[PDB]
Amino acid sequence: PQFPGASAEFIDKLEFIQPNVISGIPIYRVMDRQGQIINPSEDPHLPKEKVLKLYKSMTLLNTMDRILYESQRQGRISFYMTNYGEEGTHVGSAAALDNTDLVFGQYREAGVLMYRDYPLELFMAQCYGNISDLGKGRQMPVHYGCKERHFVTISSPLATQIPQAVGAAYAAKRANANRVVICYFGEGAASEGDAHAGFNFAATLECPIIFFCRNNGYAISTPTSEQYRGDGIAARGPGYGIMSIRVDGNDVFAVYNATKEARRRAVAENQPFLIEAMTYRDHPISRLRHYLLSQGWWDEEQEKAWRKQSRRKVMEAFEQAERKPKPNPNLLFSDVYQEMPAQLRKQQESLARHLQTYGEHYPLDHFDK
Amino acid sequence: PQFPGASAEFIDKLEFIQPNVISGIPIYRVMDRQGQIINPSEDPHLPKEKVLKLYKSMTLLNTMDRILYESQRQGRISFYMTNYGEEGTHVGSAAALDNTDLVFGQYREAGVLMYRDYPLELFMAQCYGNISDLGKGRQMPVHYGCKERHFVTISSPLATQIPQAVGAAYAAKRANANRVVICYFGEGAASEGDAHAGFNFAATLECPIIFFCRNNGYAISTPTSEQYRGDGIAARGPGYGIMSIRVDGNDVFAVYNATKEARRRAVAENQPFLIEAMTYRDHPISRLRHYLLSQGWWDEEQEKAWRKQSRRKVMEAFEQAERKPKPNPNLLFSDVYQEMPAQLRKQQESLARHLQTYGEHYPLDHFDK
Amino acid sequence: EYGQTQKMNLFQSVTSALDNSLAKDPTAVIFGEDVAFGGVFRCTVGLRDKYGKDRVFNTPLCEQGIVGFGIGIAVTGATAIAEIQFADYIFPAFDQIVNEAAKYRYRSGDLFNCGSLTIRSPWGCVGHGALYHSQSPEAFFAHCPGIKVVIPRSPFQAKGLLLSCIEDKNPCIFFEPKILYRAAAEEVPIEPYNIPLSQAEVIQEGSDVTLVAWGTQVHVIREVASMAKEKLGVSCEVIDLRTIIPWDVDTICKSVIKTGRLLISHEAPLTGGFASEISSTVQEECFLNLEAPISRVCGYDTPFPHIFEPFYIPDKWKCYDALRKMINY
Amino acid sequence: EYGQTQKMNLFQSVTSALDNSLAKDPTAVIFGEDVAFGGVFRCTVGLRDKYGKDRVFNTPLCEQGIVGFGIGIAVTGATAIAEIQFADYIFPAFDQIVNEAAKYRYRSGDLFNCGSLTIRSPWGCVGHGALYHSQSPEAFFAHCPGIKVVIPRSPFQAKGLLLSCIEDKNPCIFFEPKILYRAAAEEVPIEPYNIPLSQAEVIQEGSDVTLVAWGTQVHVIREVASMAKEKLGVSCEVIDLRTIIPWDVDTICKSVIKTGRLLISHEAPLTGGFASEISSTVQEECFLNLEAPISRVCGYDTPFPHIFEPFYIPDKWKCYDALRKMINY
Numbered sequence A, B: 001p002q003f004p005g006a007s008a009e010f011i012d013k014l015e016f017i018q019p020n021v022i023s024g025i026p027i028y029r030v031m032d033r034q035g036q037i038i039n040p041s042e043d044p045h046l047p048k049e050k051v052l053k054l055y056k057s058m059t060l061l062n063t064m065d066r067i068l069y070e071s072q073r074q075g076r077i078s079f080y081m082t083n084y085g086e087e088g089t090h091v092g093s094a095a096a097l098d099n100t101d102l103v104f105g106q107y108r109e110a111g112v113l114m115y116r117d118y119p120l121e122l123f124m125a126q127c128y129g130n131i132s133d134l135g136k137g138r139q140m141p142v143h144y145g146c147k148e149r150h151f152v153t154i155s156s157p158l159a160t161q162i163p164q165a166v167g168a169a170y171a172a173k174r175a176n177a178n179r180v181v182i183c184y185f186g187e188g189a190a191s192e193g194d195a196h197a198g199f200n201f202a203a204t205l206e207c208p209i210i211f212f213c214r215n216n217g218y219a220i221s222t223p224t225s226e227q228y229r230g231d232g233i234a235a236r237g238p239g240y241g242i243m244s245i246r247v248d249g250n251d252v253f254a255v256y257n258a259t260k261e262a263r264r265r266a267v268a269e270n271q272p273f274l275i276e277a278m279t280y281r282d283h284p285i286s287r288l289r290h291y292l293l294s295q296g297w298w299d300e301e302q303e304k305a306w307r308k309q310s311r312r313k314v315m316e317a318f319e320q321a322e323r324k325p326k327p328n329p330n331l332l333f334s335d336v337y338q339e340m341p342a343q344l345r346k347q348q349e350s351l352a353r354h355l356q357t358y359g360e361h362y363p364l365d366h367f368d369k
Numbered sequence C, D: 001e002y003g004q005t006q007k008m009n010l011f012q013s014v015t016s017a018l019d020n021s022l023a024k025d026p027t028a029v030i031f032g033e034d035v036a037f038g039g040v041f042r043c044t045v046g047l048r049d050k051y052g053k054d055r056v057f058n059t060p061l062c063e064q065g066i067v068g069f070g071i072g073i074a075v076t077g078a079t080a081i082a083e084i085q086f087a088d089y090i091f092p093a094f095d096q097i098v099n100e101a102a103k104y105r106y107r108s109g110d111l112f113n114c115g116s117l118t119i120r121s122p123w124g125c126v127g128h129g130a131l132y133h134s135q136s137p138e139a140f141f142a143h144c145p146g147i148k149v150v151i152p153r154s155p156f157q158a159k160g161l162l163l164s165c166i167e168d169k170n171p172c173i174f175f176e177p178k179i180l181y182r183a184a185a186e187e188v189p190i191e192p193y194n195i196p197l198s199q200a201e202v203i204q205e206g207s208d209v210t211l212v213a214w215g216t217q218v219h220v221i222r223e224v225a226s227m228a229k230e231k232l233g234v235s236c237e238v239i240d241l242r243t244i245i246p247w248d249v250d251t252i253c254k255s256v257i258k259t260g261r262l263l264i265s266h267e268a269p270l271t272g273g274f275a276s277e278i279s280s281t282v283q284e285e286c287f288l289n290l291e292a293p294i295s296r297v298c299g300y301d302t303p304f305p306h307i308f309e310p311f312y313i314p315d316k317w318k319c320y321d322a323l324r325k326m327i328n329y
């Protein structure tokens, strides 16, 4: 055949190509449910200090989740999204990145920030929208962002970050400084048009990006049977020309290995990689705990002391966060554009005049002045 | 593994899944370049009358193209899109449909209408925007539509028809009357978000639809190397759970066979099928002509007489179309909503008043009154 | 007046409309994200069990697909009631709404249409929704000939307007004020009834000033009328616009010819907001009657903030102060 | 004033701006559908050969991707100049523009931004473009705080405004009137120069009436000024708005305080069109000066038709007749 659109032979018999969904792409695993290494040639043999850091980051995240989830139940904060079941995918992949690799995500990615030593005070400041929040209290809780830790601010519209992450990866390529971009999203978000945009552009424009899809079988109430009919998201990668793998999201080492190799090859080859990590909506923390014990790297006394200390650190941050004032209400007007248009300043002055007269009717008590 | 998102085994070794683009999905062919049947078990053995109708529909389309393309070059009509190279994909697939199957498309689908006996007068009326145009002269040329022949009016925004065709297919399923929907689009249009929407919805919602992608290697100036990096569009179907095939678009019989089988199974099984037909931006007319000759079903005298008669019929329609007036300018206001809002009627009255006073400055000469 | 009623909040009134629709129209289907289990705001509770999984069903998470799919159902003549989970997430579908749904009938010379489409979506502020759980997008749609945009103020109004949208032969967007979903109930007829589209409602007669709003903001202006009467001895005519487009120009102009003053209020940002269209039109038609400049009391020209919401919204004090100044112009 | 000039039509002036940008900003890239070979309107001819395939390149056919990709480039600080092939096809990107680009700086507290993005797109009627080759979408964007929308009237203005957009630290949409691409040339400086954003230009002083328009419609109102002077002895002040948002309120209000009459014109449909925002604002600020109702002479509230275009557009006779009536009010 002589068609520029595809490289292929002729066939003289009519045969439709059938999807293989019943036996899909297999799920890569490094350690079993008892924390045992299954195949020694795949063991990354991470040193004890780093593995303890993976474990403490996961558990600290889990401690923070418990407390802020309760805070939400009481209306102390307006909203919360937990990380339960996603601690290993995020901590394990973050550990495989270079500290300056740029991260785009959404609602399940706090563990990346935790691994990058984001202060508990700042997670809280964002949820409370208090004066310490660098986001100036403008977004809903858990909409975290950190310029110093290369974690691009979350936004509620699903999948919009995917083609943006590809653009940042293209710019990184041009800048030539050995950086990857990683982009996290759920299996629900992968149904958006923007996912098809980002996957395709990353391949045709040859971008050093890792797409990290978390597939936990549900998008709110919708099971994956109503979300897609192919073999999950991993089976989509090859149709875009993207190298693809599926991993056990309860296995921090499998996540680490796959992300480390994707990062190495994405940066060297300027091509996208897709990792689909399977999780539940047999936990990553338990599994790593079993592993630590086998190595003689943890025990019940250490577990108790850390549980105690992590609760103390989170409660200290929690209490301070609740006691800080909210930002000055003037801050509602800045950063709409870099400068403030004259007409916008007029509106800001109109609010200042209004509060002068009717201020008793506003909760000024709580806001910086 | 116990993950609801995918059905798969574990694997204990890290292995990325690689796309197979160099040897892609093979291209189904029934007859060679000399019009010879390659594999007798695949010959549809269509009767002489139907095969002559395929040939005359293609050539008549080609005759009309030549004339209207020249008309466009002279500014007699404002715009034109030809069907060159796409005569076989459209005539061959149309022949495999039931006359009441609903067709969505865009700019390359006039042959479907031609096969369905759309009058030459009406193709012309749309291009000229004259009083005979059922579209009332509102859209650019070649934006054809026919309710009686179940061909949904074309619109310029690429790929928007794809999720709509899926919706019409869902509605057909519910209505239970053994109808398919077919949806045509190019390989460029397949990059749109709406293509990912329609493919996915058709699979999860189990819709009796044929997606017919024409891949001619180019979208305006853009070669497919800049459009995608997987194995064309056919290789995308399996990732959505869609049964998929690639065919030789210069081979009317291969197109016919694939569309006939896709239609049979889509309606029986309520599942989508994707056909990717490879064309050039070795012609379908020449190839079928060679076939007719081998059968003793055509010869040079018949070819001459038909060339003459088809030119005459198109020129008769062309001349009549140019001489008809354009529709009443009042028609610019109707059908915006089913009824006319009072405020819109006010605007229509404002134009009538304006023309009463300033009419000499408008080309009223040409418009119905 | 309308048969037996029962107390319903706004989400229940929506379910009642949808149920009545499915009962009387065998073609009708309801679809969108998470509609099957009853929806994130409970508007479709019970309907799948009652009418069948082929009629009340979840789609993949893809708004441009939801609307394109809905248009396709409507092209065959079947009633398509699409849900977009928050109005904030309607934008991925903007091209399918503006370029496709709105233009479908016109561009085909009425050979094809999607009149049997209705898109319903939660709308407006909710106390803590911030940038993407709060938006009021009606002005974006107001500039698009060929769609209708309708916004109710209460459960009784929601069911009557939604039934009219579903039955209207044009693609309709119906925005449901989410802060009212579980607010106070009122009596709502159990059987179907319609409230006409493109018809404002004067809910309180007045002689000194006309106040216009829609959605939850109608309740704000009702209160402002009360404050103005008590504090200023000023008599306000309070009007719920109800349909954004095509809008009831005559009812608004008639009121302003009587009062000579107009104040329009909406949660959406001032600039390019729908108040600008009403103001400009009233100015054209009522010019010689205007005693004072028409005032617009709207959201600021910013994204919708989380912690600053109490300071952002055009509340009753903002409306009252504007009114005071206008009465004194 | 600006160094050596040469005659350029509007497409050539755009190429000149882009070339100057790439020359002086090593980060800058240009991308979109069919830009590599020079573009369907020839705006990028020569640039890929001059600056390299990594800097001037084609994307897949996917507008929501083009804008999302552009935003991502800009998030790293690099200048991203995206093309959308016709403004009519900007809608697939509406969510990326409105929900993402416009809100990027605000929602992050200025930790991240996409100020270095500019989206350029052909705009406005072209004689036979019909529904999808003709649209003027500026009002849809005007209701979105956080983006700027800019529309030039000539080659000199295009290059100066486009350079300002590219350099402005906010995401800008720059609409190029396609009917002017190969219309008359004028002298345009070869070297870079800027024209300020959010600044209207009074191109002709007048005392009896203010006329406001943008894009090609500026030429229409210039002619209307001439007709009014010759036929009515009426002196018109002619103003090109140039930036749709943030718009130059002061220059327009100052002119109307002087003249006491205002007529605004645009190709876009009347309802929800940007004329409504100007009218409502001028009415608020200039109320006591208004001798006559502010008039809006716009496209009708329909999709943009093919064969009926000559009857659809707010041409010089439509503008003149409105002006005559206003002068006589």
Ligand SMILES: Cc1ncc(C[n+]2csc(CCOP(=O)(O)OP(=O)(O)O)c2C)c(N)n1
Residues within 6 Å of the ligand: A108, A156, A157, A158, A185, A186, A187, A188, A189, A190, A214, A216, A218, A219, A220, C033, C061, C063, C085, C089
């Ligand atoms: C464009 C858009 N539509 C809908 C939503 C509402 N929504 C918030 S989370 C969610 C489910 C997301 O599922 P998935 O991507 O699988 O992530 P998971 O919650 O399972 O981690 C939905 C529909 C949204 N935020 N954005």
Ligand SMILES: Cc1ncc(C[n+]2csc(CCOP(=O)(O)OP(=O)(O)O)c2C)c(N)n1
Residues within 6 Å of the ligand: B108, B156, B157, B158, B185, B186, B187, B188, B189, B190, B214, B216, B218, B219, B220, D033, D061, D063, D085, D089
């Ligand atoms: C949303 C949108 N973007 C861009 C265009 C401009 N456009 C008209 S045809 C075309 C190329 C289409 O390519 P393909 O789908 O491969 O069809 P082909 O022309 O090759 O038959 C483009 C970009 C359009 N009509 N709609």
Ligand SMILES: [Cl-]
Residues within 6 Å of the ligand: A156
């Ligand atoms: Cl959300």
Ligand SMILES: [Cl-]
Residues within 6 Å of the ligand: B156
């Ligand atoms: Cl086009």
Ligand SMILES: [K+]
Residues within 6 Å of the ligand: A105, A106, A154, A155, A156, A157, A158, A159, A160, A161
């Ligand atoms: K997002």
Ligand SMILES: [K+]
Residues within 6 Å of the ligand: B105, B106, B154, B155, B156, B157, B158, B159, B160, B161
């Ligand atoms: K289309």
Ligand SMILES: [K+]
Residues within 6 Å of the ligand: C115, C116, C117, C118, C165, C166, C167, C168, C169, C170, C171, C172
């Ligand atoms: K309807």
Ligand SMILES: [K+]
Residues within 6 Å of the ligand: D115, D116, D117, D118, D165, D166, D167, D168, D169, D170, D171, D172
């Ligand atoms: K910019």
Ligand SMILES: [Mn+2]
Residues within 6 Å of the ligand: A186, A187, A188, A214, A215, A216, A217, A218, A219, A220
């Ligand atoms: Mn999920």
Ligand SMILES: [Mn+2]
Residues within 6 Å of the ligand: B186, B187, B188, B214, B215, B216, B217, B218, B219, B220
């Ligand atoms: Mn093509």
